[PDB]
């Protein structure tokens, strides 16, 4: 389930995903697709478990070696998006590293932060329980 | 509360309840207006002849 013009290899998966999400929020788009990325699978799954995300499905073409992943940016049936905005802390040119001592709340603690610490992605709040720090990738709410 | 139509160049979500119906067509506005009118005319104990009745019109705009 690709939208149109299958997405090629961007400079980084997170930037392309951010463009897709902002365009979905702006131009009345609901389901968006991105290039295959394990971190994308993990972040989509954790956003689903967080409750802000709708169905997400991995996709394959005539072949199975290449892959992509589509997902419905969670919209209620009254034209409201669950995700209202995003921000990236870590950047491709500057992967900011913040240890366990550097995990504050999210702008009041209301938002959700994500860190790529040791294996997969962990929320900064739950990362603070396991005294785990790492490079924080994005702030969302 | 406001009830509006949406025809060719606008969002269907600019009002409370959604009605994408149209009246520019000659044969449309007749039954559209009759069915809208007889959907409220029953409240005032007044004639209601287009709500579930087979009554219908096929007429050009005039």
């Amino acid at each position: 389930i690709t939208t149109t013009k299958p997405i090629k290899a961007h400079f980084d998966p997170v930037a392309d995903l951010l463009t897709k999400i902002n365009n979905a929020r702006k131009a009345k788009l609901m389901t968006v697709t991105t290039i295959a990325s394990k971190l994308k699978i993990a972040i989509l799954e954790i956003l689903v478990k967080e409750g802000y995300l709708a169905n997400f499905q991995v996709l394959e073409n005539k072949s199975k070696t290449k892959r992509i992943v589509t997902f419905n940016l969670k919209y209620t049936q009254r034209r409201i998006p669950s995700i209202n905005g995003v921000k990236q802390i870590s950047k491709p040119g500057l992967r900011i590293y913040r240890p366990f001592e550097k995990l504050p709340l999210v702008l009041n603690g209301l938002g959700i932060a994500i860190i790529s610490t040791s294996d997969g992605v962990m929320t900064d709040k739950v990362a603070r329980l396991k005294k785990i720090g790492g490079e924080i990738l994005a702030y969302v709410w | 509360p406001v009830v509006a139509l949406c025809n060719t160049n606008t969002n269907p979500e600019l009002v409370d309840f959604i009605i994408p119906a149209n009246n520019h067509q000659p044969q449309s506005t007749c039954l559209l207006m009759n069915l809208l009118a007889d959907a409220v005319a029953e409240a005032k104990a007044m004639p209601t002849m287009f709500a579930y009745k087979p009554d219908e019109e096929i007429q050009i705009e005039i």
Partner: peptide, 23 residues
């Protein structure tokens, strides 16, 4: 095509519906 269908939740009636019975 889809091979793994997780999180059953879809968005088809994305047109607004609001303002119930009003006096």
């Amino acid at each position: 095509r889809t091979e793994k269908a997780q999180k059953p939740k879809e968005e088809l009636w994305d047109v607004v519906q609001k303002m119930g019975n009003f006096d």
